[PDB]
Amino acid sequence: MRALLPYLALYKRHKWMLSLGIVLAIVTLLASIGLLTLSGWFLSASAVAGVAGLYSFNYMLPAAGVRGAAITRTAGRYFERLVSHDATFRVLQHLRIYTFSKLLPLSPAGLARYRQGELLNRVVADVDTLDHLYLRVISPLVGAFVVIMVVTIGLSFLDFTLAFTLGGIMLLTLFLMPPLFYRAGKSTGQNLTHLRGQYRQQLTAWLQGQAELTIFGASDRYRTQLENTEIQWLEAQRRQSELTALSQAIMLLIGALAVILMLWMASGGVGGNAQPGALIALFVFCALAAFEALAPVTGAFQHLGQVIASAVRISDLTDQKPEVTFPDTQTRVADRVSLTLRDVQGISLQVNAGEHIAILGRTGCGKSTLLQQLTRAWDPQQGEILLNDSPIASLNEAALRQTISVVPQRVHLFSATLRDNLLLASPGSSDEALSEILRRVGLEKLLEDAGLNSWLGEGGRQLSGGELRRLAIARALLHDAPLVLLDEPTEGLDATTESQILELLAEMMREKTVLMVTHRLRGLSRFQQIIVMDNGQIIEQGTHAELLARQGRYYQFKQGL
Amino acid sequence: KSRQKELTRWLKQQSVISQRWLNISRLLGFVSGILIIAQAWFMARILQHMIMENIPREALLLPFTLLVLTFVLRAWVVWLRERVGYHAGQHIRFAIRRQVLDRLQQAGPAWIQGKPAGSWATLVLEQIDDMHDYYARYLPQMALAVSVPLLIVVAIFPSNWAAALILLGTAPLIPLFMALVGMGAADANRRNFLALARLSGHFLDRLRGMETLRIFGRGEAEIESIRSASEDFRQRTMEVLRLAFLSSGILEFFTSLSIALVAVYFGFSYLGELDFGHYDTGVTLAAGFLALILAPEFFQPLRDLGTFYHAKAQAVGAADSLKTFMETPLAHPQRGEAELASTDPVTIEAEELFITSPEGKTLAGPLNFTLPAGQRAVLVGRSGSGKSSLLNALSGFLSYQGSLRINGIELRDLSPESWRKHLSWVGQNPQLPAATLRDNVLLARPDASEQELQAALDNAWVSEFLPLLPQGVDTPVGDQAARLSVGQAQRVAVARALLNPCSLLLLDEPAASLDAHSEQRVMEALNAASLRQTTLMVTHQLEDLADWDVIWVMQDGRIIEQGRYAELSVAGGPFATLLAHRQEEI
Ligand code: HEB
Numbered sequence A: 001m002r003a004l005l006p007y008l009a010l011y012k013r014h015k016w017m018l019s020l021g022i023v024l025a026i027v028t029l030l031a032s033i034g035l036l037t038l039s040g041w042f043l044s045a046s047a048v049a050g051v052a053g054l055y056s057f058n059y060m061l062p063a064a065g066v067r068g069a070a071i072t073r074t075a076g077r078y079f080e081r082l083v084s085h086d087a088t089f090r091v092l093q094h095l096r097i098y099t100f101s102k103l104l105p106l107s108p109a110g111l112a113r114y115r116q117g118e119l120l121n122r123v124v125a126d127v128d129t130l131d132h133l134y135l136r137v138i139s140p141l142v143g144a145f146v147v148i149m150v151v152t153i154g155l156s157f158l159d160f161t162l163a164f165t166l167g168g169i170m171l172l173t174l175f176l177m178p179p180l181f182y183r184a185g186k187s188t189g190q191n192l193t194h195l196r197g198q199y200r201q202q203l204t205a206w207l208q209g210q211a212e213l214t215i216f217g218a219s220d221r222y223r224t225q226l227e228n229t230e231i232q233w234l235e236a237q238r239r240q241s242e243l244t245a246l247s248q249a250i251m252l253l254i255g256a257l258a259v260i261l262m263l264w265m266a267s268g269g270v271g272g273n274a275q276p277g278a279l280i281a282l283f284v285f286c287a288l289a290a291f292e293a294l295a296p297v298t299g300a301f302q303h304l305g306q307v308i309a310s311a312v313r314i315s316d317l318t319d320q321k322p323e324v325t326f327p328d329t330q331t332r333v334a335d336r337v338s339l340t341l342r343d344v345q346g347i348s349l350q351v352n353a354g355e356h357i358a359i360l361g362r363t364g365c366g367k368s369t370l371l372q373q374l375t376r377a378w379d380p381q382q383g384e385i386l387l388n389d390s391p392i393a394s395l396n397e398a399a400l401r402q403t404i405s406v407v408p409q410r411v412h413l414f415s416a417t418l419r420d421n422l423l424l425a426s427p428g429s430s431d432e433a434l435s436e437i438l439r440r441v442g443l444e445k446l447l448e449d450a451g452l453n454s455w456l457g458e459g460g461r462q463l464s465g466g467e468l469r470r471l472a473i474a475r476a477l478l479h480d481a482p483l484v485l486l487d488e489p490t491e492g493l494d495a496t497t498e499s500q501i502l503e504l505l506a507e508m509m510r511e512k513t514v515l516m517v518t519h520r521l522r523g524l525s526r527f528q529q530i531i532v533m534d535n536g537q538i539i540e541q542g543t544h545a546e547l548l549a550r551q552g553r554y555y556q557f558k559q560g561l
Numbered sequence B: 001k002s003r004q005k006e007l008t009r010w011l012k013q014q015s016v017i018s019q020r021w022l023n024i025s026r027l028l029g030f031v032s033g034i035l036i037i038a039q040a041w042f043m044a045r046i047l048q049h050m051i052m053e054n055i056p057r058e059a060l061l062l063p064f065t066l067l068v069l070t071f072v073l074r075a076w077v078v079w080l081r082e083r084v085g086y087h088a089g090q091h092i093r094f095a096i097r098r099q100v101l102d103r104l105q106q107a108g109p110a111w112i113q114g115k116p117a118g119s120w121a122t123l124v125l126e127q128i129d130d131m132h133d134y135y136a137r138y139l140p141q142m143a144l145a146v147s148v149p150l151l152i153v154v155a156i157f158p159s160n161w162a163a164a165l166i167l168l169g170t171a172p173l174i175p176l177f178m179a180l181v182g183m184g185a186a187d188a189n190r191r192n193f194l195a196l197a198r199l200s201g202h203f204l205d206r207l208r209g210m211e212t213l214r215i216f217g218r219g220e221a222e223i224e225s226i227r228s229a230s231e232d233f234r235q236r237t238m239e240v241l242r243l244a245f246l247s248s249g250i251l252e253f254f255t256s257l258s259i260a261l262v263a264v265y266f267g268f269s270y271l272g273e274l275d276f277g278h279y280d281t282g283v284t285l286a287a288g289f290l291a292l293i294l295a296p297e298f299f300q301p302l303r304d305l306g307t308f309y310h311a312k313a314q315a316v317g318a319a320d321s322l323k324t325f326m327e328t329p330l331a332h333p334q335r336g337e338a339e340l341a342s343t344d345p346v347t348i349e350a351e352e353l354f355i356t357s358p359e360g361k362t363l364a365g366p367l368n369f370t371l372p373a374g375q376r377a378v379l380v381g382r383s384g385s386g387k388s389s390l391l392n393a394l395s396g397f398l399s400y401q402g403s404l405r406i407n408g409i410e411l412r413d414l415s416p417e418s419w420r421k422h423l424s425w426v427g428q429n430p431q432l433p434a435a436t437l438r439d440n441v442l443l444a445r446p447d448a449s450e451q452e453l454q455a456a457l458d459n460a461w462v463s464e465f466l467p468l469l470p471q472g473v474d475t476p477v478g479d480q481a482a483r484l485s486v487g488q489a490q491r492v493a494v495a496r497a498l499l500n501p502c503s504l505l506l507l508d509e510p511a512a513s514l515d516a517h518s519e520q521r522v523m524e525a526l527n528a529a530s531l532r533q534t535t536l537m538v539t540h541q542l543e544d545l546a547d548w549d550v551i552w553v554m555q556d557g558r559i560i561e562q563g564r565y566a567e568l569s570v571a572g573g574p575f576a577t578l579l580a581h582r583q584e585e586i
């Protein structure tokens, strides 16, 4: 329950919309409780008064209470739904903004968790579940508690021993019963999570491995096993309904015990009266209508277990420690950046301004983390990385992100318009200045039919590997940075496209320092100071001709395979 | 012809599976309406005696006893009706999920490959279970919304026809205000649950791309995009919910008016200001409470139908995804009855072959190859040239409209159950679907002798890294074989393919995305096992193909060149271009 404090403190924003959505729930509940209590007394009082007692009965006061309790109940219900749904969308946005703001400064390192694609589908589903805490848990539980107190306090003016035995019954079933039913089905709700995640484990292994099951004749016996997990799973769901059925029968018996007690106890005297008369129905009808507030409480408390389970998962991620700290000093971005390194994983190299380097590693074995720690994904403990005669750790993020434009190995398509996938690099670029770059990088087929408004990514127009690589270079070309980091370009690309992209770099990154890492020997003659390394150690370096003439390791690379 | 009404029309057709369970639940909802009337009549007769006749409570032990039983019987029917409702929804989900898996196993790996396994699990697991509360709680309540209100009026009509007409007067007005705005808002709301699913898919989009937002400085700009997209969704939803929530407000107005009117009519009938509505007999107090205790119970079945709105709203959203899935037409491969006579290496032939995807799209163009018995061919080319489709067709996963003859027998004629017993495939990725590492190797024949299992483990070089595993040959692999790396997971798939002798061996780039040591061990094992039967391999390790006797350089779904490695590496054709592009790797 202490895990929810970071997310109940986000309620300070819109704390009036949230508190209005709970007041309106109480007012609507009290108007319905007071409409049947006033009506029950009116029939009793007017019947004992009779035709003789028509005079001096003063039925205009109840008429203004019948009229008042109906408007506050029909307008309260309409506005309780409006305000509480409006406030649910407002706290969902603030949960989304808070989660993104916390998860971003720890993006590379803090999110290298198992099943990265599945790690983020849980975060989206966990943020959705925190969104339920207000309407599904807080509004019913708080709304029911205040209604029980207002009824008990307001009903104790007539009699104390009758208000405390109806309010006491309602308070016992609000505080005792929701926990007794959450603990009675905590065992059934734990092997129901075990079986749900086991059926998904077996189903994914049955769908992903369908080629290797049909061929080897095991598809039918791995589905019979799958159907047995479902049958076990459908029984744990059955026991979770044998316990929801009981929690609804018992709620009907507690509301039946309050009615029986009010009929019995209040017939022996209300206040000091020997024969209460009309006051008997006031207590009986206040017990019939008062248990409409306690309907959600047993299921509201059950959902609180899932909201807490989500609040500890999100706090596991967002309450981490970022591995990179950015000083807050407003500096200038240089038009020419000379990159220098000194004993960092180590390896040391010099990248003078205006020259194109190429780091040539052995097919992923090196798995160059140089580009990660050069954009400050993690601080380098080995040595120092200097960026234009100033340590890289002393550069403000808004200035570091401007002096380094990296094209990644995994380029992301943001499921938006083709324009929004390129204002990502330079937001202020004009539409015409953005169409020139797209035509200049071989991406002409995109501008065919409403291209700059064409939805990319998830909605449609999925880009091909060669085309999706030309988009990363398009972003780096719009995002003018004096230092460009090419992370394994032209990998998995056909020989026609690879020659077209290496030519794309040489003529458009002409005045920008580049740092290209590859395991391919194509088009390295145009790079001065080629660097060849293995397992994080520089074997040799120099110009393409100088490496060939040296008859070194790079000569062996060009000789056969 | 709105989609909202088409999906609800689909949800009801699935309910005939549990028609017995929905009938029992509809019968118990009628008994609930009878015990509600019995409760109200006993409470009214007790309250009249203690208010009008001033009878002491000790003389009413007969109506109290019958009132307690009416409450105990009410709680028992609620407990029965809540368990019967589950069995209604369980047997519908069990049958729909069986239809989904049948529709998905028949389509085969060709169509399962279209969507990620995470998305298939959403359909089979999350969306099918989203229809439960429609069948378990909504449908049984929409039958209680007409069983009980109509049964209440039948009980108040004999006692007082004016109090029954007050409740019955509101009976047609509630659906009358559903024909004004109910249809308009309900389908508009269905398109707001879609926007809520898109907005949830736009936050996930920004979460999946925080690596790209980090290296461009767009962290603060995408917070404003989340703020604007969220604020956009709320405004358009609150424009519809400003009208959708009129249904709950109006229904809460008629239940207030009816309770008010029953109290005003009876209240002023006792005082003598009214003289109608009673069957020529003085209106009694017990008749007033009967028609007042039953006024909230007239509208309660309707007001609990709004409590279950999300049961319908999230089942219609699940019906949208499942109706289209079961309606998309697919072109399954044509299966037959013919059986291969012999276990000797098969001969492959093709004339104007046209491999086609299930959705009808042609993948590989005209193919005219021929592979004699016992020979080992190679498929080479660029990615997207249709060479991974050719091996799918030979396995029976893709339909075709050409000619693909196995030992002279057409592949459509061959029975898939018996054809694939002469077929071994190693494949691009391991995909170990069993529990342990021993149960993956023994997938082909689980009853293999302990000596024969060691033959496959040693040949595939699985036993060289077995001691590195915590439990050895019985080491579990978990989900996606994460216990062991892809280099040594592929060697498990090799041991599985070499377990039993086959007739045609398919190798779809077995040593791609493998480490240096594992690739060496895999090749040496698949270069020794490719000589034992008819082999056809897709590869890009073009420097090692000197031994293989036939090479098919395939581009754009067409075999554009043929010959051995000796006469292709110097021919200067499309293979020399491919070989040169490979020689630049290191
Ligand atoms: C379509 C759009 C929409 C949306 C989006 C939504 C979203 C939402 N929601 Fe909702 N609702 C609605 C529409 C809606 N909605 C409606 C219409 C209603 C009505 C109901 C009645 O009738 O009353 C409700 C109702 C409702 C309720 C109540 C129920 C009862 O009564 O019990 C609740 C609780 C809720 C929650 C919620 C949430 C949490 C959310 C987040 C996710 N909701």
Ligand SMILES: Nc1ncnc2c1ncn2[C@@H]1O[C@H](COP(=O)(O)OP(=O)(O)O)[C@@H](O)[C@H]1O
Pocket (backbone or CB within 6 Å): B110, B111, B113, B114, B357, B358, B361, B363, B364, B381, B382, B383, B384, B385, B386, B387, B388, B389
């Ligand atoms: N099930 C499928 N449905 C639709 N298109 C497919 C399917 N399987 C493959 N393709 C497409 O067919 C083309 C050629 O076949 P593919 O197997 O991809 O060849 P390769 O293995 O050489 O890449 C590619 O565009 C591929 O994406």
Ligand SMILES: [Mg+2]
Pocket (backbone or CB within 6 Å): B387, B388, B389
């Ligand atoms: Mg392929």
